[PDB]
């Protein structure tokens, strides 16, 4: 059953050229709002040598604020969930995969996720450590047969304001027949503060209608 409150536990397993690391942590939100707020801590691997943010979006659409009238790919998938997978090309020939798992226990939700990245250079703004956030987004999201397909073009904010350009293409996927919706865009809010070694992250995330 899904709360107006729903917690999460997460844990990630992931890679960037070579450093191996993972991470921890717990969220809470209001899925019906679209609203969540997670606190993440580096288990393994840490401290992290690249920008927290190529993580971020990998840590759930259950959090969607979707209209009443247009069928709720995510929450439909409940009580058993739904799993994804991912491509980030950046425009500096960096690449990243990642995929996750999103289940239920006793608790809340469980996330489980990989990331691996390459070829991010060794003297550039994520090596260094330069990423402030990400634009807010607007992902399209078509139906395809069973599936969901996302596209979304991502700007990460570097100190200075300059921005960097990556492409990001997901497969939603749910373990049963739902309900498909029409093609519609999910728009995205994801901003990331710290809390001493707490790497804490909000996302607002509302599904519209095109025209």
């Not at 927290?52 to 009443?68: A, G, H, M, Q």
Request: hydrophobic share 30%; no cysteine; net charge negative.
């Amino acid at each position: 059953v899904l709360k107006e409150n729903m917690k999460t536990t997460y844990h990630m397993d992931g890679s960037v050229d070579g450093h191996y690391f993972e991470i921890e942590g717990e969220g809470t939100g209001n899925p019906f709002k679209g609203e969540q707020e997670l606190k993440l801590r580096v288990t393994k691997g840490g401290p992290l040598p690249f920008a927290f943010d190529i993580l971020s979006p990998t840590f759930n659409r259950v959090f969607t604020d979707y209209p009443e009238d247009m069928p709720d790919y995510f929450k439909q998938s409940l009580p058993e969930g739904y799993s994804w997978e991912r491509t980030m090309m950046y425009e500096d020939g960096a690449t990243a995969t990642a995929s996750a798992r999103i289940s239920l226990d006793k608790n809340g939700f469980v996330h489980k996720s990989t990331f691996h990245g390459e070829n991010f250079p060794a003297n550039g703004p994520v090596m260094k450590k330069k990423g402030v956030d990400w634009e807010p987004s607007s992902e399209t999201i078509t139906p395809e047969d069973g599936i969901l397909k996302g596209d979304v073009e991502m700007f990460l904010v570097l100190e200075g304001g300059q921005r960097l350009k990556a492409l990001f293409q997901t497969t939603y996927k749910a373990n049963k027949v739902v309900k498909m919706p029409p093609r519609h865009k999910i728009e995205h809010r994801l901003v990331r503060s710290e809390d001493g070694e707490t790497i804490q992250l909000q996302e607002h995330a509302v599904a519209k209608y095109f025209t």
